[PDB]
Amino acid sequence: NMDYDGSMIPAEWYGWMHYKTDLPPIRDGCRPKYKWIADHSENLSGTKEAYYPYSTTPNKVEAWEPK
Amino acid sequence: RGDIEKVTHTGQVFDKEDYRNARFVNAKRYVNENWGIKLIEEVPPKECTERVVFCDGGDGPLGHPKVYINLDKPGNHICGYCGLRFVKK
Amino acid sequence: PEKIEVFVDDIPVQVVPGTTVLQAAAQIGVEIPRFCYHERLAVAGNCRMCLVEVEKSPKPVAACAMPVMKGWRIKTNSDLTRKAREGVMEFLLMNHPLDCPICDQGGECDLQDQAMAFGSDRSRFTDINYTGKRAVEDKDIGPLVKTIMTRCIHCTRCVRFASEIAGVDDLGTTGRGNDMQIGTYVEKLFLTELSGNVIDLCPVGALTNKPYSFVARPWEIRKVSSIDVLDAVGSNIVVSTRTNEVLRILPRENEDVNEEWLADKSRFACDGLKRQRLVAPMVRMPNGELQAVEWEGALIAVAKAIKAAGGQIAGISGQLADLEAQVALKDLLNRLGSEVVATEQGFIAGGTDNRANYLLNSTIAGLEEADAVLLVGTNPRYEAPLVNTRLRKAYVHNELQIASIGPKIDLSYDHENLGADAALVKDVCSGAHAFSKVLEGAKKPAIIIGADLLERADGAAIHATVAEYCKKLKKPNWNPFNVLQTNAAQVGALDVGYKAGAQTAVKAQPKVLFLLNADAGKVTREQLPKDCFVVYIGSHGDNGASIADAVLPGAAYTEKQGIYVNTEGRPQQTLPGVSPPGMAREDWKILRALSEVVGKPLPYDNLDELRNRLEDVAPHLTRLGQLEPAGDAGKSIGGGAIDIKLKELRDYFMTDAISRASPTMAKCISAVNKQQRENEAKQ
Amino acid sequence: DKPTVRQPDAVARSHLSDFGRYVAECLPKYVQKVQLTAGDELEVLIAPEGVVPVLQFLKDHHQAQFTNLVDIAGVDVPCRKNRFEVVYNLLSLRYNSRIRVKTYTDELTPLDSACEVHKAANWYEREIWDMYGVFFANHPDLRRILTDYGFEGHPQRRDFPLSGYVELRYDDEKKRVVCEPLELAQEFRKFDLSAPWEQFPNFRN
Amino acid sequence: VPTAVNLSPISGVPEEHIRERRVRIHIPPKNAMQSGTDNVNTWQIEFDNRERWENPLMGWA
Amino acid sequence: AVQQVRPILSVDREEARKRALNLYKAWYRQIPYIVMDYDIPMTVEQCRDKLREEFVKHRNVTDIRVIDMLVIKGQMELKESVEIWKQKGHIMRYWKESQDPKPTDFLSKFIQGVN
Ligand code: SF4
Ligand code: SF4
Ligand code: FES
Numbered sequence A: 001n002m003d004y005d006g007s008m009i010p011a012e013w014y015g016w017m018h019y020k021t022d023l024p025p026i027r028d029g030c031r032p033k034y035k036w037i038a039d040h041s042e043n044l045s046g047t048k049e050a051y052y053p054y055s056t057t058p059n060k061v062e063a064w065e066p067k
Numbered sequence B: 001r002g003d004i005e006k007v008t009h010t011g012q013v014f015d016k017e018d019y020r021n022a023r024f025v026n027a028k029r030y031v032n033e034n035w036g037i038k039l040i041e042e043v044p045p046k047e048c049t050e051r052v053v054f055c056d057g058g059d060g061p062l063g064h065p066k067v068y069i070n071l072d073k074p075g076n077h078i079c080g081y082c083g084l085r086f087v088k089k
Numbered sequence C: 001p002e003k004i005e006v007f008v009d010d011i012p013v014q015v016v017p018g019t020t021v022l023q024a025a026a027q028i029g030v031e032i033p034r035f036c037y038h039e040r041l042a043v044a045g046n047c048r049m050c051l052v053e054v055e056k057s058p059k060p061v062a063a064c065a066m067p068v069m070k071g072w073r074i075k076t077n078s079d080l081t082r083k084a085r086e087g088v089m090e091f092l093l094m095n096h097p098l099d100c101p102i103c104d105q106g107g108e109c110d111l112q113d114q115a116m117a118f119g120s121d122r123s124r125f126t127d128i129n130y131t132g133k134r135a136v137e138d139k140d141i142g143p144l145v146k147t148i149m150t151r152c153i154h155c156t157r158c159v160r161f162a163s164e165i166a167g168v169d170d171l172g173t174t175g176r177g178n179d180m181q182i183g184t185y186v187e188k189l190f191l192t193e194l195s196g197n198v199i200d201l202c203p204v205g206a207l208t209n210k211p212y213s214f215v216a217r218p219w220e221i222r223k224v225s226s227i228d229v230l231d232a233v234g235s236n237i238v239v240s241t242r243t244n245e246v247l248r249i250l251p252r253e254n255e256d257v258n259e260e261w262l263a264d265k266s267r268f269a270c271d272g273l274k275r276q277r278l279v280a281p282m283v284r285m286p287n288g289e290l291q292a293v294e295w296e297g298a299l300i301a302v303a304k305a306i307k308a309a310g311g312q313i314a315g316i317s318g319q320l321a322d323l324e325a326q327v328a329l330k331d332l333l334n335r336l337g338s339e340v341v342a343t344e345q346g347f348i349a350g351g352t353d354n355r356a357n358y359l360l361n362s363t364i365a366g367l368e369e370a371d372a373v374l375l376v377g378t379n380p381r382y383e384a385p386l387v388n389t390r391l392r393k394a395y396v397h398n399e400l401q402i403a404s405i406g407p408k409i410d411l412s413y414d415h416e417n418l419g420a421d422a423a424l425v426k427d428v429c430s431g432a433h434a435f436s437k438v439l440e441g442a443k444k445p446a447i448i449i450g451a452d453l454l455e456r457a458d459g460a461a462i463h464a465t466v467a468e469y470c471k472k473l474k475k476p477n478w479n480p481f482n483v484l485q486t487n488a489a490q491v492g493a494l495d496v497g498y499k500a501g502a503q504t505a506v507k508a509q510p511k512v513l514f515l516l517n518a519d520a521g522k523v524t525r526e527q528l529p530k531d532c533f534v535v536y537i538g539s540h541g542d543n544g545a546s547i548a549d550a551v552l553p554g555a556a557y558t559e560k561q562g563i564y565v566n567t568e569g570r571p572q573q574t575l576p577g578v579s580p581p582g583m584a585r586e587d588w589k590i591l592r593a594l595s596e597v598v599g600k601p602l603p604y605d606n607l608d609e610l611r612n613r614l615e616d617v618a619p620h621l622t623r624l625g626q627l628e629p630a631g632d633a634g635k636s637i638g639g640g641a642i643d644i645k646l647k648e649l650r651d652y653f654m655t656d657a658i659s660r661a662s663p664t665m666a667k668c669i670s671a672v673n674k675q676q677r678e679n680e681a682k683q
Numbered sequence D: 001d002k003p004t005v006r007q008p009d010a011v012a013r014s015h016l017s018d019f020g021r022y023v024a025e026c027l028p029k030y031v032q033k034v035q036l037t038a039g040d041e042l043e044v045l046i047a048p049e050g051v052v053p054v055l056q057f058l059k060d061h062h063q064a065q066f067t068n069l070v071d072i073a074g075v076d077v078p079c080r081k082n083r084f085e086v087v088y089n090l091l092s093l094r095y096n097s098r099i100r101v102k103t104y105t106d107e108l109t110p111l112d113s114a115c116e117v118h119k120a121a122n123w124y125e126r127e128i129w130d131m132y133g134v135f136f137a138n139h140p141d142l143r144r145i146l147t148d149y150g151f152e153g154h155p156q157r158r159d160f161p162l163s164g165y166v167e168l169r170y171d172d173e174k175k176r177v178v179c180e181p182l183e184l185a186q187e188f189r190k191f192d193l194s195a196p197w198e199q200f201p202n203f204r205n
Numbered sequence E: 001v002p003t004a005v006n007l008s009p010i011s012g013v014p015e016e017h018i019r020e021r022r023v024r025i026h027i028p029p030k031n032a033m034q035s036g037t038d039n040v041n042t043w044q045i046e047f048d049n050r051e052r053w054e055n056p057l058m059g060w061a
Numbered sequence F: 001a002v003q004q005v006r007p008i009l010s011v012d013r014e015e016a017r018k019r020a021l022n023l024y025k026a027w028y029r030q031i032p033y034i035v036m037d038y039d040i041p042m043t044v045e046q047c048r049d050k051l052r053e054e055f056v057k058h059r060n061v062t063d064i065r066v067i068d069m070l071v072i073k074g075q076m077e078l079k080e081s082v083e084i085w086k087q088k089g090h091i092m093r094y095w096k097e098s099q100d101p102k103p104t105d106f107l108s109k110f111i112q113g114v115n
């Protein structure tokens, strides 16, 4: 209560709520369901569990390592 | 927290002496749990009879461009787009 | 002789009668499309793209190999020419795989650009749905190449390059018709010091750089002109830099030096700038360990060791050092009262004053016009491979006959070995041997001497003997004396005034010693006294840096701007395409800062003032890309057998420290030894 | 027919050809070369000293009533001896047409202002003052119009870099918006999109 | 007027880039993997490459 | 060599020198109205010293068209300072009050960074 926002709607009901499709996901047999599809998450900004970026490539110049 | 010391699928992790782990005291590190390598070697290879086979991603127009793989060489032949493996007995 | 008139695109032009349609077209400016015509290879008619319509002819002619006659009107922009080009390359593109996003040649592929210009807009190939296009298996040609034979268009450039320039005939054309595959019949490795150029010569990119595997894209690449320093040819290259990282080394066309050709060691050593680098200044603390310190503390430690030396100071120049660091090192040693400097590769005594004793006096572009050459203990296939390409071109075209002195070597062409004794080196200079009569009867003779015989003392007299024979072989605008060096710093150091003896600094017995990019391993700690202080200035950690009491990190040849002088004497300057990593800086800046910390500063604070100081040294080092003709070169022969250091490919791969640091050369050596051990297991 | 290829207008080509020869006959001193480009547009390349009368002629002749001056465009070509070129685009409502009058200007050579003829140029040449840096003599008000008040240099000159030379931030020990040397967080990745094979054989002559 | 005209104070360039940068006039190198010479057909001015670095946040140049 | 060009507001060097001295006089009169109005932390004498330094770094030019272009640009800055037409952030840009100075000796430049 008093914490509702627009990010609580999952991916299957998002097109039904935004009038993209007239088919609810109860009878929408075309929507896939794979093993790697994660559950829906809200916007976690302003929270200790937010996103913060980083470099994905590792170090490309290696030093000596005298020993 | 184990997400700071977790390694991504590109082989990247910050060291314990690095100053760049100070950015993760207030926001958690995002590491994708679904590595593409494990989910592409979980798919078994497809046994085929013809000398050449065609791959299109398994979706038609929604997959990759259609390419032809030769199967006369023994072993597993990997499609360079989707990673599906073909084999001829 | 006379010039015949041909009307190309309704434009009259006077051409030599031996020229073809495409040469006259390139003379007036129009570029006729091609896939198999390379001007350094033999002509062929297999790609059929260059079809042009000449007047009063029933069929179009191939412009690459049809010689012109008087009165022809060639129409490049005709309707029949464009129809023929569109049909021919539609046939080229009916069986090409849809591999453009996973193809490393894409963005600079000839087939993509020749479809956007003089190509059709849509594919007429209905049969993609059923009984579709072909696919052929990949052949493990080598560890340097990545072969996807489905993308090959059968243009026969790689086979002509192997059988014409590379020398070995491992590549071939198997099969007949639509199932023809351009590859080796068995699982073999194609090995040449020139396989990287095959990636250059493949127009579609079926043959791909395997160290440059999916790394970047050609529109993204910042291209910077540089000169490779690992070989002594001084070949002009272009370096691919994107987002402050080296990607690959590609040839840049200089007709005098390299002519679109690059060695495998010069090309596939871009990984060596990434591994075993030096990023921090290191000082050997008295507990026995080399620890990384700050720049100012390392500089004052080297200054305190210099002040504790008190007159016994010597310095050794290496193989990767440029002209400017050698000038700064010699200026620092001469300002500190030390008259001894050293170079790693040795030389004869008294040959410093005249350039012709250490110069490839015949031009590398002129060596293709030689009629008979003599090799005195050198292997130019591995020591300086573009000189071997020039000798192969002169062997193919100018009917060159070549005799060699030393052990049995493969020069990628037919040659006769006279022997291994040095006394017959006198005999060719005496006139008793028949090859002396061959050299005297030749129109443009030459004698090529390796530098490792000039490292020897008594063979130095051999040098003088060859000079006497050059007084019997002098020709107008042709100097027969030739000395083929190994590293790119020896000629520059002898131009400055270095004593090229590496044992000279050991015999001087200094208290502090300067190693400037030296990794040859000629100096150890047991030769030096116990109070020595070895200072390393170079960029790569190796056996030169393993014996150093103070390690100062430098920049590589792609990270600094520096003049290098090759064997022929052409001084060329590299360009800083990528910033140095860590706390590494330019070497002459390290020497100037050391002069500031010690107390006697060098008079130059900028690079242009250092070029002015080089002008004060010698005016020919200031001008770049211009070679002045040197003068004439100016006796107990020892009984030692003549030996060559580079006799095989595995010795050629680990010549230099940058080539030592890279894992590509280790992969090549492992693949070569694996192929040899499988051959020995099968036999 | 050819549905992909654009069909031109023959009567507009004939009318602009006759009017271009008429303009080249009327002013032999200032008109340097009259050309008719593809797309049925007439370009009258003129001398710099004829910048003010020719437009006046094109304002005031009975077969040249180019009442509107829609814009003035400057093109920076550094390879030429006279660097900038200045393109006046004029619209005629009476004869329902357009003309382009092109002149060349050095970095220091003036241009006589067309504000006595067309008042819209009262700002338009100001833009050419700000973007390129050519002085317009007899201008009622010549100032920088689009750039910063403390800006140095001219932006759309090709010698000027894309990202400029300086940046602005906020500084608390001075309590002011301050000027700093330019450092991008990520540099502008230059793409090499030059064509290696020529496509148009009609433009090499 | 003399034809040798210095326009450094007019162009708005800072003086440090005037006294420090070196300008290379060159014909651009042909791509060795491509037979086309249309991009070779011009000369061009380019400026000397200074230091690039990695930003500590995310890893750009 | 020799070249015949159209002049900008002056024929010879003496008129351009007179225009530069007119700029110096007008900027001298405009400085005390700049100081009291713009809310800047610069004393009037520091402003006049900065004006002198701005003229000193352009004393070296000799060409009259370059001098007159500098006169035109200085007149534009004067017109942007008579009417206020600006803020205090742009007036202080001449002093470069935010840039920390860099050393000129080679040892400190070697220690700090490659620039
Ligand atoms: S060879 Fe050329 S056309 Fe074929 S897939 Fe590669 S980039 Fe595309
Ligand atoms: S592999 Fe490349 S170079 Fe060799 S024939 Fe095929 S397309 Fe030509
Ligand atoms: S270029 Fe003439 S047939 Fe290939």
Ligand SMILES: [Zn+2]
Pocket: B055, B056, B057, B064, B079, B080, B081, B082, B083, B084
């Ligand atoms: Zn696939």
